[PDB]
Amino acid sequence: AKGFDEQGNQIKIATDLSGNVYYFDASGKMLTGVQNIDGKKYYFDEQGHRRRNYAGVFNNEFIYFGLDGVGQSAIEYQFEKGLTSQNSVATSHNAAKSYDTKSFTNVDGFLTANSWYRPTDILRNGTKWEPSTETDFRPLLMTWWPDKEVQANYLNYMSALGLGDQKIYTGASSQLDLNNAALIVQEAIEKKISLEKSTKWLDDSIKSFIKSKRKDIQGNLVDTNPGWTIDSETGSTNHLQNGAFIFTNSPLVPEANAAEGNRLINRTPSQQTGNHISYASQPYSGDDWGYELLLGNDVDNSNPIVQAEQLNWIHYLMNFGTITAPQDPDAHLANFDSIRIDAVDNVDADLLQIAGDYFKAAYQVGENDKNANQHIHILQDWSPNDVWYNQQVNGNSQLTMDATMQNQLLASLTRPITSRDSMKSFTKDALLVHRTADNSYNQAVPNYSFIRAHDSEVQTIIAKIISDKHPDLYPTVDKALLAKDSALYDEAFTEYNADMQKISSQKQYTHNNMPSAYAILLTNKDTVPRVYYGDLFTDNGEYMANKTPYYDAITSLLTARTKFVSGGQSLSVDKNDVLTSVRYGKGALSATDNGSSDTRNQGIGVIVSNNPNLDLNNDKVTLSMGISHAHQAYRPLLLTNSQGIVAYATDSEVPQNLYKTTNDKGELTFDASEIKGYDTVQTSGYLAVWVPVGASDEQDARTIASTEKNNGNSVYHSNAALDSQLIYEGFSNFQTVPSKNASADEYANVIIAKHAADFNKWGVTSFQMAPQYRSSTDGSFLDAVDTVQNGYAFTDRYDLGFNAADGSKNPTKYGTDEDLRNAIKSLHAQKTYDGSSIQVMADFVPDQLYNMPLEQAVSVIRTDKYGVNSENPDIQNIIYAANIKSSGTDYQSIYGGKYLAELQKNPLFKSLFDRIQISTKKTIDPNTRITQWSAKYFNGSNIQGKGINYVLKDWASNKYFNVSSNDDMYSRLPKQLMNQESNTGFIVDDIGVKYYSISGYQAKNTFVEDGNGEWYYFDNDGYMVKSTEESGPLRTVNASSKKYYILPNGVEIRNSFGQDIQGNTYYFDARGEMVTSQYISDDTQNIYYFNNDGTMAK
Ligand SMILES: OC[C@H]1O[C@@](CO)(O[C@H]2O[C@H](CO)[C@@H](O)[C@H](O)[C@H]2O)[C@@H](O)[C@@H]1O
Ligand SMILES: [Ca+2]
Incomplete structure (x- = not known):
């Protein structure tokens, strides 16, 4: 296939429609093999194509043709030879006061990018080293960085804030310069601190550095520190909040480990047993649309201590009046009556039985309609099969929805x-x-x-309107449920309301x-x-x-x-x-x-x-x-x-x-x-x-x-008595949220009380109130945006609107605890046709908790909402600083499990406690109290965008820094920070090559990426692995069955084709691993197949 130019057909730098680069010699024949053009070597395969990222011996020369398509000598070392000491005049001073918890802000011993520490001296006002006080904490990132690129980025960022050298650094830049420039940055920092009398500004600018973004060679904003943002937490998108972790056990994090046979995910009514069971017959469907991870932090309701805490909570709600206002002689009239089981398809169905047992025990609902119909519960069961699970398996202890x-x-x-x-x-x-x-x-x-x-x-109609107006920001209805700007709602709503006023033929949305x-x-x-x-x-x-x-x-x-x-x-x-x-x-x-x-x-x-x-x-x-x-x-x-x-x-x-x-x-x-x-x-x-x-x-x-x-x-029976009942859902997501200084009569629970008779006039027998739990305002989801704090997104499941510590009224969206108690009393005071009170329904929300205040180290796997490993290599049982621990001074800590001791002792509840639960095959466990939620009580969580590498860690040793333990499974502090000898770099030795991280430790049994970008591996002995003539390039390295291609200089090639001295070709993926039994698509649209052996097809 000759190459001709438009003006004239000459061949003597020729291209192809795919991008393939042919060069023909003088007079039109294509060349193959190794060719030298303009003093550079270029490899042309047997097809004639010039090729990039190709390694092999050619005419007794091992040549690596890079992204250029330009040969490099595999034998010659490609790294900087030499060490650089990390000890300076200042390291004696910047070394940690102590090497323990008291001198480092930390997470279960572990450190993160926002760790602050106490040095032995402070450069006070940038001019005099003074002994540090107790409060003289400085950010870790002021004196230490996990590699040179981060150090470099940090230096340029601080300089862009006027705190630095007006010139540019990179991971290419030298180790010694970065260290000296850091000291200049340190002077400026400390002078600013003396001036302001504050480090908040600094905390602000360190926090903002970490999440900072950068223009790149392409010219689009990237993250400056990918490993410390949501960017790095990639996996499946199938979860309402775009990703999900499963908490898993690991010896590095003993306190977040769950017991054996807990964290049973997906125990939905259909799959309570461990397997789908269609209960549905000929005409009806027996599908299950459930899944365990819905929203926020997922409570593990397959744990029996948790299950007891769920009981405890139901009891508290059903006795909210008597519990929260003992002095009041009418407390017994301010109690909830029934429950709405929420997200039935997202929790262990054991809870449906736990609850049914409770009402049989407390209010004898099993003996007749009169008692049963006095406490009407309802299931949020969407799946078609649940109707029949409810009937066959669950009595009809709660009412199914007719969908x-x-x-x-x-x-x-x-x-x-x-x-x-x-x-x-x-x-x-x-x-x-x-x-x-x-x-x-x-x-x-029933x-x-x-x-x-x-x-x-409702919320999906609103989200459609937001999406149709701003497709660019929110392109689907599910993604529009993450909208948080109050302006976007107001806008959507003026449309929603206007559409509702239109004639039917012009009703575009409603x-x-x-x-x-x-x-x-x-x-x-x-x-x-x-x-x-x-x-x-x-x-x-x-x-x-x-x-x-x-x-x-x-x-x-x-x-x-x-x-x-x-x-x-x-x-x-x-x-x-x-x-x-x-x-x-x-x-x-x-x-x-x-x-x-x-x-x-x-x-x-x-x-x-x-x-x-x-x-x-x-x-x-x-x-x-x-x-x-x-x-x-x-x-x-x-x-x-x-x-x-x-x-x-x-x-x-x-x-x-x-x-x-x-x-x-x-x-x-x-x-x-x-x-x-x-x-x-x-x-x-x-x-x-x-x-x-x-x-x-x-x-x-x-x-x-x-x-x-x-x-x-069945508990309930579909008859005349039961049809006499009616439920009124007494709230909306988008009710305006009484502003801070709202007058007393805006609050919905006050308005409810006023209008109590209206609901009775309408035939209401069960008033379904909203969830009453104080809401998060973090906007992580709709229910938690500050303009709709509806109460499905909460941190303290026992706090229904109590006053503040100073004794100031501090309500929820709907009102104080006072105002709630009164709402219940007003409704109770109304009497229906059979003389009995209008019931008040509690929203029972066991599925999750949002927005917890404390971090805890946990081991995670990246998954979808069903729990299925998204199979991201870098998120396989790694350690994450999760916001997953409750304050322990909240109302959970007061009331958590408080009534379990009392309830066990009661004879009427013997059945409940003695009951073997279906999914656990064990009984409920009321002997432990839950006063602080911890990671060990959660199935998992939605991705929190901390970053994979947020938990800090030494690349050479590949262990996590940990300041609370001295166990070998963790790396000790950076040698610089404890004023010991510390050198970093590649050092060539008579035997081989060793490498020391920026922290001063030796690379052993790990892959290490150079600043230049080439990867290298270091064996158990602490030496670089390198192929020899006696031992070819195709190599297993770590007893993993995983073959890599390592050149003579120790370069472990990636995204690249490699060769046998025999003549076979292999391809090595992004992670450098050999590819097998697969087709590979080339940049120029060329296709290659690789056998199970790993060889290329022909
Ligand atoms: O809201 C989205 C999604 O969740 C479901 C699950 O049944 O709703 C319940 O659970 C959510 C979290 O607790 C709340 O947002 C919602 O208010 C509650 O009814 C579904 O109805 C809905 O598709
Ligand atoms: Ca769940």
Whole structure:
């Protein structure tokens, strides 16, 4: 393949479309082998290509062709020969006062880049060496660095702050110059310190140096110290916070090691046993979407001491009043009643049983409906299989969510017209509870159903808006949940709120048909509905301060549910796709049922279409109420017209003409004159609700719980009593956060108390409050940004808003502990239809803790959210300074495990404590108290961006510095810092080459990278490994089965092809290791295959 130029076809510096560099001799023949061009040697393979990073003997010359494609003599040493002493006049002075904990700021003995130490003397005001006081600490990085590049970067950085030599240093620069320039930098530092009377400025500029960034040869900002930033913590992205560590044991860090057979990750309901078990049958799915590492620092709920602490916590919540306000004689009225188990799919399912046991023990919930229905818990179980795990395995100790209902309501009603399912879908088979002919009790699986929630169908709508406005910063919805700038939310919200006010056909972001959905939800049989604050009030702004467009319609339904909704049910959808849901009224379970005395004035009927151009065209819609409703007058509760939805609240508000009367089969019959298609803010399609005329004020459709003893597996039973319950989720993420000096009546828990009667009027029986735990403000996630401190991101699980130490009121987002106790008392003081108090639900959040105050050394592996090793070589059981230890002066320390001694002694709890837990196969363990959270109680954590090499360590010895131990497994301090002889560099010897780190220690059994960039290895004897003629270049070095290619000068080549003296070719990856049974892509798009042997294919 000759090479011709455009102007003329000459060959005598030729290129190719791939980049391959041919050079043809005079007259057009390509050359191969070793060639000399302009006094440089260049290697051309047998294909003709000029090649870079290629090593081999050619004509009895070992030549390494570098990135240039230019030969270097492998025999000649490529390192600087000579040592350099690290002892100077000042090292006697800068040496540590003492070589122990008292003179070094440290992490479990280990050191980090932000370690400060106490020298024996201070250069006071840069002019006189004085003995250092106790407080005369200086940053380690002022006098010591882990290698020359960091020292160099440090020198230039300090100089750029006016504290230095205005000239440029690099790892190329000499060891002795860097040391002398450091001293000049030290004078300037110390003069600044005398002037300011402070080192905060210095701490600030050392901290900011570490994370500093740099322009490079390419011209883009890199990290100046990659090993000390998140940049170095690379692995899988599949975790909400872009990475995750698993804590693992290691002899270097004895106190962070967990016991044997703890840290059982992924014990989700489906996989509690250790293996998936589909509990689901023919129509239903048995999938599990769970995973152990969700957010923040992951509590290990497979540890039995932790499990007991989870119990302890539930007891504390259920007795929060009596515990926190003993002097108060009404303390017993300020206790939580129920729990919401949170992130069920992200914790050991053993907790679901721990909790079920507790309520059987404390409140005897197992004996009947009356007791069971007095404490209604709910699971946050998203996975399809959990519904059936809950039933078969877990009794029904907590209520499962009906997600088939939620998704159907969303797909058939809320979507835009393009995306929307048919109303027929409501009669389908995959639905959890068949309602076409629901005519029994105690058959359905007990469940709560809802449409939206603080998280579900809210925070993701907001995040989509942020992402669509700033794709460059946040390109997905999951990544937008990490947005922290209050400006970004305000902006998104003015859009969100504006969209909600728009007609349905122009609703670009927010849900359609919300009242229509709520009409079906609130009139459905066999479920406990949950209402989201944000469907009555706006998701943002002040608590209960602004109504949505749906408030009238939804509140109308909510009160109407109280009066009319009872009895059997039937759903239909006529030829026109118009849904008709009917409740027959109490005492009547079918359309052919004559009923009781209660039936006549009860039993609602609902009409829903989802088609904005519904044109009946001589067809009729029919509401078959019962034969128990024949010849009966009916009147509307809700109706849609072009202005919106009308809500009639009494018989007398209805104009007489709108009344209409059933025929003899109890059928209502609607014309095209009545039902048509619409497009408003609140309805695309039609909506109507009809109630029977003549109901009384006394009338209440609900039913009292049975006292009869239940000998069943399930705690709850889907019947009339249970359908009489309703849950109201009483909060939003984006409620405005009462500012520091907010007046007392902004706080949501005060507002709650005021409006207590309103919730009772709506039929609320279980008030689901927000989590009450004081929030982090670190913005590591949505829940923890300061403009939404919702309480799912906390450090102290026992602190629900206590006053400060000085006795100043110091609230949470929602109010003080006082204000909470009162909120509970107000709700408790309200009494529902059966005379009993409105329940108050605690958010039980066992999964994680955010934002802990103290560091601890731990061993880590880089993984994804499921726990799967991301297989980063440099993050395999390494040591990390993790923020993972609680203060030990927090409320955890007071109340942690406090009641376990008390609870064991109780006879009623014997079952609970004696119970063998499924995943642990051991019982719960209440004999240890948890007053300080430590790393040993955590499965792992999200990546904290400290850096891999944040924990300091000597490259030559390859051990970690440790100031608290003298054990050999750690390196002792740098010889310079303890005023001993210390030299650094490569030193050639009659036997071979040794190397001493900047710390003064000998390289033994390690790889070492030169300042020039070449790697070298040092054997057990402390000598460089180097191939000889007797021993070829292809070599194992460390009993690892890993072959490297080491030239005669000791250079261990990387990202490079190497040769046998025989003629075979091998490729050595980024880590210098030989490649085997694989294809290699070249920069110029050439492909090479390497066999299992490691040889290149041909
Ligand atoms: O919020 C994101 C994600 O987490 C889930 C897990 O069930 O929500 C629960 O757990 C989170 C951390 O505790 C909280 O943000 C959230 O408020 C809580 O409901 C999912 O609902 C959600 O997809
Ligand atoms: Ca977990």
